Design a protein around this ligand. Structure first.
Ligand SMILES: [Mg+2]
Lengths: 59, 126, 59
RNA sequence: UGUACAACGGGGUAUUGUAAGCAGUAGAGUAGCCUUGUUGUUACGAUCUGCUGAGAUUAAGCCUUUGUUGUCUGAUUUGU
RNA sequence: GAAUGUUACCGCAAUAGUAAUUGAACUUAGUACGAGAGGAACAGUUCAUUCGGAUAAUUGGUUUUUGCGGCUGUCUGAUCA
RNA sequence: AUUCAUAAUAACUUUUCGAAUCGCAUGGCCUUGUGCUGGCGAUGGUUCAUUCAAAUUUCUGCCCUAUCAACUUUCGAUGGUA
RNA sequence: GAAACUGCGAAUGGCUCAUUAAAUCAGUUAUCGUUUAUUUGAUAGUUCCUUUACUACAUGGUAUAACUGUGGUAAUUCUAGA
């Protein structure tokens, strides 16, 4: 039986990776897939205007 | 009614059986018999007396109580949402490892743009 | 007492306050890290198995 | 001549505190050997560990017994 | 313990003796009484003092259980005992 | 003034350090590749010297008391070897 | 640009004079008897380990904070689990 508050729900991992090889194993890509485009972004709406503020890639 | 434990021998004390000794440091020892009371007053150590639970623990006699624990071997089994990932589309992008020649296709346009910008800057300097 | 139960797979967690002392007597004389089946404490937790991670005493 | 009695034995309960013997790559160290080393073995060595909450004792005013072995007609006296 | 017919069981009860004692706390009530200061009592409850009769589950004491272990000195060739 | 500095041989170390770091400028060479080179700094780092110091240390030097004249050395007191 | 990790600093300063009579201290010597963050200036071509596929060097790996959320206690610059 599924408990009302635990298995009914699922919460998101608040942040995504920042290191390159961490991304590359997160998506299992390659030594060469150019991680810069596989970046997780988070579109916010400060007002009507929006922006994504993708973090960085260290290393 | 509680069943207290002997402070020297680990025996079980039933009500109305044995004695209690309050030491000057306000510690309470409980004895099931004059034997263990006397050995306490003779200030012997129960880890050296062979009939005591403490000795038997220290020497591993009747040691079938706890054996061991396992080691964890298993996956995560949850690609949970990264809160800006949209896990379904994130998996759709994870399967997008093939057809990665679009990466070089975009690198070609970036090379064209960087070279045009270099030429533009070299011309603007003049 | 109370149980702060957590399902790390979905990543969620919930409190459950508990009475019926002869249900929680199962936890007694157990260590942290040990496993317990939940039907002995509640058949709402039937077929589950929990692992004890910590706790906080009175005071 | 029988849910008889006794002596033994067994079991339980209790008391003590882990028997003797064997073994040990345990052991403060010491001497000797040579295959001369690569734990080298031999001997001496309080003690420790294991077989071992073991052994011993347990009714003489403890408990119980499907056990074994036995015993079970001697003498005196008494009458409204 | 002889004798009362013997023997056994269950009993009666003349006579004699006689045993229970004292106090505190709470409550009564800071009430009654009294100008006030002060300050009760009966009933009830819980405990205790002195005495007495039993008992030994527990605690304690006692130990020739010479029961178990340990220690000394010597004797049994050493060991075991 | 040295068994100083330094160097050289023999090996030893559970093995030290020898840049996976950051910013601005973005320039030069071509066999035009995200090719090869390249500036001004920051930070970090072994050793040496230096500096800021520390630690110990030499010599001489301190008030009143003899109604304190002997003290230290048991177990550190004075020295020696390790 | 809050928070938090990291690095530094917090051993300075300021207060007081209880101790302390060759002790501190003063001036004068020494370290050929040693430590020294920081500064300042100099200074590592040598490290692929059967070192001919053993290797990522256009550069390797894992945690964990802050953060999200669930809580404990009367209470503290308390804190657990995920
Ligand atoms: Mg420097």
């Amino acid at each position: 039986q599924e408990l009302e508050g635990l298995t009914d729900t699922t919460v998101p991992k608040r942040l995504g990776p920042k290191r390159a090889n961490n991304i590359r194993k997160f998506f299992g890509l390659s030594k060469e897939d150019d991680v810069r485009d596989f970046v997780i972004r988070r579109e916010v709406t400060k007002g009507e205007k929006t922006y994504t503020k993708a973090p960085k890639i260290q290393r | 009614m509680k069943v207290e434990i002997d402070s020297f021998s680990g025996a079980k004390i039933y009500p109305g059986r044995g004695t209690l000794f309050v030491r000057g440091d306000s510690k309470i020892f409980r004895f099931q018999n004059s034997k263990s009371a006397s050995l306490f007053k003779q200030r012997k150590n129960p880890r050296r007396i062979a009939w005591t639970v403490l000795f038997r623990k220290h020497h591993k006699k009747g040691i079938t109580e706890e054996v061991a624990k396992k080691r964890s071997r298993k996956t995560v089994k949850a690609q949970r949402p990264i809160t800006g990932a949209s896990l379904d589309l994130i998996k759709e992008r994870r399967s997008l490892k093939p057809e990665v020649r679009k990466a070089q296709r975009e690198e070609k346009q970036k090379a064209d743009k960087e070279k045009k910008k270099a030429a533009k800057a070299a011309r603007k300097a003049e | 007492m109370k149980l702060n139960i957590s399902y790390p797979v979905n990543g969620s967690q919930k409190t459950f306050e508990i009475d019926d002392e002869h249900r929680i007597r199962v936890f007694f004389d157990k260590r942290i890290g040990q496993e317990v089946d939940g039907e002995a404490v509640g058949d709402e937790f039937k077929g589950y198995v929990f692992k004890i991670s910590g706790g906080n005493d009175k005071q």
